[PDB]
Swiss-Prot record:
Post-translational note: Phosphorylation at Ser-415 inhibits leukotriene-A4 hydrolase activity.
Result, substituting residue 134 to A: Strongly reduced aminopeptidase activity. Strongly decreased affinity for leukotriene. Abolishes epoxide hydrolase activity
Substitution effect: residue 136 to N: Aminopeptidase activity almost absent, but keeps LTA4 activity
Gene3D superfamilies linked: 3.30.2010.30, Neutral Protease Domain 2, Peptidase M1, leukotriene A4 hydrolase/aminopeptidase C-terminal domain, tricorn interacting facor f3 domain
Protein name: Leukotriene A-4 hydrolase
Effect of residue 136 to L: Aminopeptidase activity strongly impaired, but keeps LTA4 activity
Consequence the record notes for mutating residue 296 to K: Loss of epoxide hydrolase and aminopeptidase activities
E.C. numbers: 3.3.2.6, 3.4.11.4
Active-site positions on this chain: 296, 383
Expression by tissue: Isoform 1 and isoform 2 are expressed in monocytes, lymphocytes, neutrophils, reticulocytes, platelets and fibroblasts.
Gene (UniProt): LTA4H
Transmembrane segments: none
Effect of residue 384 to Q: Reduced aminopeptidase activity. Minor effect on epoxide hydrolase activity
Length: 609
């Protein structure tokens, strides 16, 4: 049979497809285990199907029951990061389209790569522990046995037993709570996901969670320490959803809840269906970062509804998501702003290609992950090279309203399906058959299969960017004789996004003489800004130019939150600044117990402890 996805060891979708999962499990914080049963409804695509294979990783299997009787099963040899295949002998031979229910009793490993267990000290509230999953790309197989490939999409229902003081949430619609009948110290939370999803979008959180309703289809959830601030910061979520619906078609998932993770959370957002994960570093206080969740909102069409069939084609997901997201922001702030964000994106692609090297296989849009762990293959290239291809095509084919018609038709065509780059390109050619002569001038080989920068750069409106450049080239090429020439007015017409962009361009040419940065503080007072993006780049600029006043401010930001994007480079700068190195090592030791274990480990490695 045709093998779809080489990152999966399970029977491929051409042989059988999982249609539904019923998960009944219990979360044990003492053992750091999930225990229970996974009932998979599986549909055969062949005749005479007598066995099938599932992905697993570090699972303990107690038994497999089919039609009331335990069945034989065998775990195969482990294949590195893919885990161990689990072969199940069926009690009957299945015919094409025939279905069977397979109930696997399992327990996860405390070292499960999919499950992040936090100690009380690593939470906001400091009393209760906390659990969150992170299945993308191929970690769902370390939670339960499955066809762990986005080429298969299933619905699911779940029942999750947790200590009664805690709350469970999942990538699904909440479906009620009851006391656990087998244990009065525990509650059972139920969930239902009626839209078929790839299993990497199965997600679970258990913790001391509270909610605020902020829209007809939106609750925000967090620990009590963050929930009120979060309800304000993200109060415009519903208006963003309505904009996304206008751009991409109906939102099919029912609810759109938000979860603001604990400060120790080392990552960015995650587009879990019905429950977007939000990093708390977006809590700027002025909503200047609230539009960032337009990324996860957009995945509800591009990635979650139309999905990449394998991880080689992940750019189809991220690329179309960034394209939709930049349209949401264009609706909110204007077309000039969409071009501002697009041009910044091109800059990030330049940096990514330079970091990897322009011949590196990961700077291709379509990547071959045959012998590469997809869990460690993420970069900005699918995001920004994919966006650039779509923005180039938009300009080639008659502009944004016309290409937005293509986007809507593409979503409608492939909703609830999983597709490859060739499926996408075939549909592009079909939709734009009236313009094939134009499409045939595109260097598809270069764009899709070649490393490095794209062969053509799109046309970017420069209005909002030129402002930041103008001021950037003024500070750098200045002497002590000119520092008095700066004043607050220099920032009068610059948005928070433009402030961020100015600091980005200024940091890129660090160090600045101390007189300049001292002046820059005197007139601009960047010490006062709380926007995590702005505060980050500013503090790096101060340390990399050896200002004493900045040492305590950077140490504070580096330990108050654990997002790797900020915490790691800050400790790197503080370690590299000889004046602060000793203090940076000492502060790390004092706070490392409250960090996420992976942040604690990598900063320790950087600090050479
Ligand atoms: Zn994304």
């Amino acid at each position: 049979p045709e093998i779809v996805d080489t990152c999966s060891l399970a029977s491929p979708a051409s042989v059988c497809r999982t249609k539904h999962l019923h998960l009944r499990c219990s979360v044990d914080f003492t053992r750091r285990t999930l225990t229970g049963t996974a009932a998979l409804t599986v549909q055969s695509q062949e005749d005479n199907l007598r066995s099938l294979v599932l992905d697993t990783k570090d699972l303990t299997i107690e038994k497999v029951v089919i039609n009331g009787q335990e069945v034989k099963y065998a775990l195969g040899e482990r294949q590195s990061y893919k885990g161990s295949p689990m072969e199940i002998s069926l009690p009957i031979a299945l015919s094409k389209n025939q279905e069977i229910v397979i109930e696997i009793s399992f327990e996860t490993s405390p070292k499960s790569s999919a499950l992040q267990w936090l100690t009380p000290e690593q939470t906001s509230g400091k009393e209760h522990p906390y659990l969150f999953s992170q299945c993308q790309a191929i970690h769902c197989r370390a939670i339960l046995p499955c066809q762990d490939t986005p080429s298969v999409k299933l619905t699911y229902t779940a029942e999750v037993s947790v200590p009664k003081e805690l709350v469970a949430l999942m990538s699904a619609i909440r479906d009620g709570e009851t006391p656990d009948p087998e244990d009065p110290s525990r509650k059972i939370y139920k969930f239902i996901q009626k839209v078929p999803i790839p299993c990497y979008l199965i997600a679970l959180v258990v913790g001391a969670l509270e909610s605020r309703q902020i829209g007809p289809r939106t609750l925000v959830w967090s620990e009590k320490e963050q929930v009120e601030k979060s309800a304000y910061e993200f109060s415009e979520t519903e208006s963003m959803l309505k904009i996304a619906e206008d751009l991409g078609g109906p939102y099919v998932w029912g609810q759109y809840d938000l979860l603001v993770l604990p400060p120790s959370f080392p990552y960015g957002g995650m587009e879990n269906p019905c429950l977007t994960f939000v990093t708390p570093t977006l809590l700027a206080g002025d909503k200047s970062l609230s539009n960032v969740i337009a990324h996860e909102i957009s995945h509800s069409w591009t990635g979650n509804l139309v999905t990449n069939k394998t991880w080689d084609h992940f750019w189809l997901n991220e690329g179309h998501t960034v394209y939709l997201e930049r349209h949401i922001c264009g609706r909110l702030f204007g077309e000039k702003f969409r071009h501002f964000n697009a041009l910044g994106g091109w800059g990030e692609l330049q940096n990514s290609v330079k970091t990897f090297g322009e011949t590196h296989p990961f700077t291709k849009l379509v990547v071959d992950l045959t012998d590469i762990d997809p869990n460690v293959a993420y970069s900005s290239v699918p995001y920004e090279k994919g966006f650039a291809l779509l923005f180039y095509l938009e300009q080639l084919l008659g502009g944004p309203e016309i290409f937005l018609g293509f986007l809507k038709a593409y979503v409608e065509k492939f909703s609830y399906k999983s597709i490859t780059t060739d499926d996408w390109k075939d549909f592009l050619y079909s939709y734009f058959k009236d313009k094939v002569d134009v499409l045939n001038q595109v260097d598809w080989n270069a764009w899709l299969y070649s490393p490095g920068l794209p062969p053509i750069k799109p046309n970017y409106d420069m209005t909002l960017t030129n402002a930041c450049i103008a001021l950037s080239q003024r500070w750098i090429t200045a002497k002590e004789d000119d520092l008095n020439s700066f004043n607050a007015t220099d920032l009068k017409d610059l948005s928070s996004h433009q402030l961020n962009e100015f600091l980005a361009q200024t940091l890129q040419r660090a160090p600045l003489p101390l007189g300049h940065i001292k002046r820059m503080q005197e007139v601009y007072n960047f010490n006062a800004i709380n926007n995590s993006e702005i505060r980050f780049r500013w503090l790096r600029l101060c340390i990399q130019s050896k200002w004493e006043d900045a040492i305590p401010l950077a140490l504070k930001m580096a330990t108050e939150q654990g997002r790797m994007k900020f915490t790691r480079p800050l400790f790197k700068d503080l370690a590299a600044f000889d004046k602060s190195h000793d203090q940076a090592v000492r502060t790390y030791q004092e706070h490392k117990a409250s960090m996420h274990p992976v942040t604690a480990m990598l900063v320790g490695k950087d600090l050479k402890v």
